[PDB]
């Protein structure tokens, strides 16, 4: 189906401790494949997925230089941001960047992204048309004027329509068997008296992370007291999720769990 | 691959 490549930059300033920490992580869909950390022994782009390892020295060298320059740029940006908000020179602040491309099954551009947050709040985003910016702030307006004069949006569009799509294409080709992977969940139900009793619907080892787990009453859903935890990484590039209802020990053969995941040929119905 | 400048120096912000 659709696929996306995404990069996540985090830059954190320090009080009087030198240069901000820059970290970058790259994903294709729910799979991370590259990292960079400026605080590492030697700051270097490293592989995090098997299908990116085949990349030759020039790839890591170049991408590493990109990360280094971007780190410098993020530092100056943190400086300017400190200025815009009249924050003190001693504070520690965060600049986050989030960009990348979504393509369809034909591998052509569907949507582009490029946006920034300062101290955890939306600061400035490239619009859907990929030609203008939405500034969240009075400060972000300064950034907006600065970029509009320098026509930066055109360059971001150039990336998102150009190299982004091409690289994503190459990664989907090289990692096909794991990126076009759809691992259906391994599912089961557990029960704990207290005793009100508890039913737990378990889904483990699935990919991608997108999944739906519902507890129904004779066919109408008990979102109400279903206790639903976040989808979590298993640590082996698969994900886990479970839902829970506490009920009394009465009429349990109509509590149904329904699992929908794109690796399932048909939606699953579970009962203990 | 991450975004490079295509021949100049980055935005600022």
């Amino acid at each position: 189906g659709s696929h996306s490549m995404r990069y996540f930059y985090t830059s954190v300033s320090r009080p009087g401790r030198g240069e901000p920490r820059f970290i970058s992580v790259g994903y294709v869909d729910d799979t991370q494949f590259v990292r960079f950390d400026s605080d590492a022994a030697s700051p270097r782009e490293e592989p995090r997925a098997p299908w990116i390892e085949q990349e030759g020295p020039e790839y890591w060298d170049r991408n590493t230089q990109i990360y280094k320059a971007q780190a410098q740029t993020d530092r100056e940006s943190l400086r300017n941001l400190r200025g815009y908000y009249n924050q003190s020179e001693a504070g520690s602040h965060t600049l986050q960047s989030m960009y990348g491309c979504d393509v369809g099954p034909d591998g052509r551009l569907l949507r582009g992204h490029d946006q920034y947050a300062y101290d955890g709040k939306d600061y400035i985003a490239l619009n859907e048309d990929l030609r203008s910016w939405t500034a969240a702030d009075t400060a972000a307006q300064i950034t907006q004027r600065k970029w509009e004069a320098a026509r930066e949006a055109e360059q971001r569009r150039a990336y998102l329509e150009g190299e982004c799509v091409e690289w994503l294409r190459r990664y989907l080709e090289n990692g096909k068997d794991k990126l076009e992977r759809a691992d259906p969940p391994k599912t089961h139900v557990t029960h704990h008296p207290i005793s009100e009793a508890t039913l737990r619907c378990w889904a483990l080892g699935f990919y991608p992370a997108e999944i739906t787990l519902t507890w129904q009453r004779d066919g109408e859903d008990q979102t109400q007291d279903t206790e639903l935890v976040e989808t979590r990484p298993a640590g082996d590039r698969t994900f886990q999720k479970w839902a829970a209802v506490v009920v009394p020990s009465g009429e349990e053969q109509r509590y149904t769990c329904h699992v929908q995941h794109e690796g399932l040929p048909k939606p699953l119905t579970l009962r203990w | 691959a991450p975004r490079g400048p295509h021949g100049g120096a980055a935005s600022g912000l």
Partner: T-cell receptor
Amino acid sequence: MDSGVTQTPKHLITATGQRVTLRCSPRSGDLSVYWYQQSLDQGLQFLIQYYNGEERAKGNILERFSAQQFPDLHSELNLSSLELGDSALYFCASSGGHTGSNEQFFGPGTRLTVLE
Amino acid sequence: AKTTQPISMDSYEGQEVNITCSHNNIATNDYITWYQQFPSQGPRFIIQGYKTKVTNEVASLFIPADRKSSTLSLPRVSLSDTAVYYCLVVDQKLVFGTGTRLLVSP
């Protein structure tokens, strides 16, 4: 802008084995400075690029060539132990500010003639 | 990669001037970039493109699907356009070849 990249001095004649320093001011708003060398009937060869005081990129630059970018963003390229082959046009460029992200704004250049 | 382009080209004012550039090994990150330079003066950015044809106020730039070639097209040259034109494929560094020296005659 408003002010383009500036380079001083316009020219320089100096004996082999000696030392010179070339000065450059980036275009107003630009935080990044480049140095290039143009030998006779050649394209420019990239020497070194700084961003906001920090070295960002090196070319095939000899260690006797050494550069610097100061807090006011102006830069100095000092050429040491000069020899005949160092005779060239030395260009300074700027970016990262008002100049577009994909462009470099070049100064008028400093002409260096090294004589024995 | 590297770029190979004509060493020189002649033209009369009023004509269209098309300078083609070869770059068989253009990399995914490389952008097709052209610079102009008058003698002993700072070179100036002309135009840049990736996949599709680009037209601006000074010139056009044709780019085939392979990306192995490109053509700088100056719409109607004048004596002012006598200069050296550099074709580059660019990621981080500007690597200048010898460029095409274009002479515009009356």
